[PDB]
């Protein structure tokens, strides 16, 4: 979303023109930011915060996959896996800060919807073991054995 | 109740 002043944000309107143009200006700025992000080739955007409605609309307009991760540990692990840098602002990523993954897709395993960042190479910084089972306790025991 | 100008219950 568009960053805001940390101290106190207050939109001051003194003429009808400013009132009639403020929302259009905000929408134009958001569209320009998202298009600048997309023009770098980034077809997947992962954020650790909330996603604004206009930001989601403009990401869907330019065919950008959006994934939201609440945990900062998950964000760090994803950065390690793909090879990206967690940008602090909404600037487009530089050539080195843009991670590359061989396949990102939405899939359903059993009754759970999952998002997979798949590498075709038999390497990588982080690997994942998906455990199946008929009981949560059984899978916890299998996880202990894996540990 | 409500609208003390007319002194009647509205809505």
């Amino acid at each position: 979303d568009g960053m805001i002043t940390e101290t106190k944000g207050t939109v001051l309107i003194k003429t009808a023109e400013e009132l009639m143009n403020f929302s259009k200006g905000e929408e134009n700025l958001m569209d320009a930011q998202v298009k600048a992000i997309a023009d770098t080739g980034a077809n997947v955007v992962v954020t650790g915060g909330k996603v604004a409605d206009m930001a989601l609309h403009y990401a869907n307009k330019y065919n950008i996959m959006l994934v939201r991760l609440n945990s900062k540990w998950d964000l760090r692990r994803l950065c390690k896996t793909v090879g990206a840098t967690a940008l602090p602002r909404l600037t487009p990523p530089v050539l080195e800060e843009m991670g590359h993954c061989d396949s990102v897709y939405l899939s359903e395993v059993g009754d759970t919807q999952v998002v997979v960042f798949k590498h075709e190479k038999e390497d990588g910084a982080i690997s994942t073991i998906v455990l199946r089972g008929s009981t949560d306790n059984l899978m916890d025991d299998i996880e202990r054995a894996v540990d | 109740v409500w609208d003390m100008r007319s002194g009647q219950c509205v809505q």
């Binding site: 944000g9 207050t10 939109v11 001051l12 309107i13 003194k14 003429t15 009808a16 023109e17 009132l19 009639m20 403020f22 929302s23 409605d53 609309h57 | -």
Partner: protein
């Protein structure tokens, strides 16, 4: 296709026609009613002319959104966010259909 329950129509909804033979549907996530422009927005004026101009500006913002929707050529308007009574009457006057607060799914 899709079917869902009627969602809290406002005044003037019964004027809108309830059958179309080739409608264009305007799927929106927009709150079409008069309201404060922003939560933290504040208007500071020192002239009654500016007061009237601000009121007219709010009304013109709402009617500009409604006019863009109308000129889009749609006949059925669906919005996830609430659609106000003013927008309902505006769409009724144009033989259009409106339905706000539609569930997201």
């Amino acid at each position: 296709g899709v079917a869902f329950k009627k969602t809290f129509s406002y005044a003037g909804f019964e004027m809108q026609p309830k059958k179309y033979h080739n409608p264009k549907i305007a799927l929106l996530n927009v709150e079409l009613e008069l309201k404060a422009e922003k939560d933290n927005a504040e208007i500071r004026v020192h002239t009654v002319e500016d007061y009237q101009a601000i009121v007219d500006a709010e009304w013109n913002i709402l009617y500009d959104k409604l006019e863009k929707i109308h000129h889009s050529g749609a006949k059925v308007v669906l919005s996830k966010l609430p659609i106000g009574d003013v927008a309902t009457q505006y769409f009724a006057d144009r033989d259009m259909f409106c339905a706000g607060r539609v569930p997201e799914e």
